[PDB]
Write a protein that binds this ligand. Structure first.
Ligand SMILES: Cc1cn([C@H]2CCCN([C@H](CC(C)C)c3ccc(C(=O)O)c(Oc4cccc(Cl)c4)c3F)C2)c(=O)[nH]c1=O
Ligand SMILES: Cc1cn([C@H]2CCCN([C@H](CC(C)C)c3ccc(C(=O)O)c(Oc4cccc(Cl)c4)c3F)C2)c(=O)[nH]c1=O
Lengths: 195, 193
């Protein structure tokens, strides 16, 4: 079994990369692809609260992402890993660390303590970071507040990866998506075949 | 202003005590009574998930009580404290410590760390613990009785590590005496500013 998460800002082609990597891995491994809330009822109700929120307090928002993370983890991820599957998860703890923690300014260490209560030791075995430059990312997406937030998410991810190098594998997401797909696929197959 | 919370297991007389204390305090203070979620829209939505739910993971449950707590604190408690109000709050951080942390077996320090993220340093000015014995509290199935006992054991462990804001009121005595001891404790804190 393997728990592999995918991280990156918007415009990193992450969703495109995970779907293509999944289509290729299914030919050789027992694997599922998922994301939060991913159909878990309580998680879906939590998502409705997040999306209906008008200037919601950032700590309440972080706790709701963490509660959706726990429900998804318990009802989808853990049973799949128990069945010996490879689980590909599009966004996990690092997304709360970069977004709520760094970019929103709650602090990475505080949001990490919250998410450690939620995941209870279940950190990914490997995290694929789609390292896109702010300028390339922006072009894949297409005001000043949105550009500044996108750059702060990217800075956040750099800070997280600097302190946890062993868990992460950075993939150059500035290259064409065919190459991003290929480098990500190779990184995963290398980790999996070493187990 | 003052942020006063009330803690205790079931059968402690808490709802009666808060209401009677409110009626006495309102003569000298601008006081409000509240409880989480307390009408805060996001908190009300969260409460529906906790109630209209089935066999929910205990950690997920703890995070939802913590999220409702933050919403009620930021949109209701803090604005009332800014107005100079005495806020009488029925259950706060210590209920999560006793119920989620001790009784449900998540762990007290793990639940404390979650709730410190939610309250972000806003601990009560005073906390009234309505100290009722498991036997007296039971009178006021086996699983529910063991859980009620676990809750009291939980509350006992919290005060064994905290004494400043914590004020234990003997809740085994008749309700008139419980109200008097509570009111007198609050007024002694309030008069000392
Ligand atoms: C997993 C995760 C994602 N994000 C971001 C990633 C980029 C997109 N955004 C938006 C934020 C909203 C407020 C505009 C987003 C986009 C789509 C959905 C969507 O699902 O349509 C969404 O709802 C979710 C997604 C995951 C979990 C939950 Cl509880 C809600 C969402 F928050 C979430 C965080 O900030 N923290 C996290 O832990
Ligand atoms: C504040 C608090 C209370 N409780 C208990 C105290 C005793 C009553 N119970 C029940 C549990 C449910 C699952 C049957 C309870 C009873 C009534 C309501 C009710 O309000 O009808 C309720 O809903 C709430 C209350 C506070 C916050 C939230 Cl999110 C939901 C509730 F959880 C909550 C906890 O376990 N943790 C806390 O942080």
């Amino acid at each position: 079994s393997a728990f592999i998460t995918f991280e990156g800002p918007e415009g990193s082609g992450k969703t495109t990369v995970i779907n293509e990597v999944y289509h290729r891995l299914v030919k050789d491994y027992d694997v599922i692809m998922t994301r939060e809330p991913g159909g878990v009822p309580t998680g879906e109700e939590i998502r409705k609260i997040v999306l209906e929120g008008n200037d919601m307090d950032i700590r309440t928002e972080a706790m709701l992402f963490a509660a959706s993370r726990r429900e998804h983890l318990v009802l989808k991820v853990i049973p799949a890993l128990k069945e010996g599957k490879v689980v590909l998860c599009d966004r996990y703890i690092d997304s709360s660390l970069a977004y709520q923690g760094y970019a929103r300014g709650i602090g990475v260490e505080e949001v990490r303590a919250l998410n450690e209560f939620a995941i209870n030791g279940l950190y990914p075995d490997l995290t694929i970071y789609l390292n896109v430059s702010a300028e390339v990312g922006r072009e894949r997406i297409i005001d000043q507040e949105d550009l500044k937030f996108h750059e702060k998410v990217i800075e956040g991810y750099q800070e997280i990866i600097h302190n946890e190098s062993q868990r992460f594998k950075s993939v150059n997401a500035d290259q064409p998506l065919e190459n991003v797909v290929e480098d990500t696929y190779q990184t995963i197959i290398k980790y999996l075949e070493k187990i």
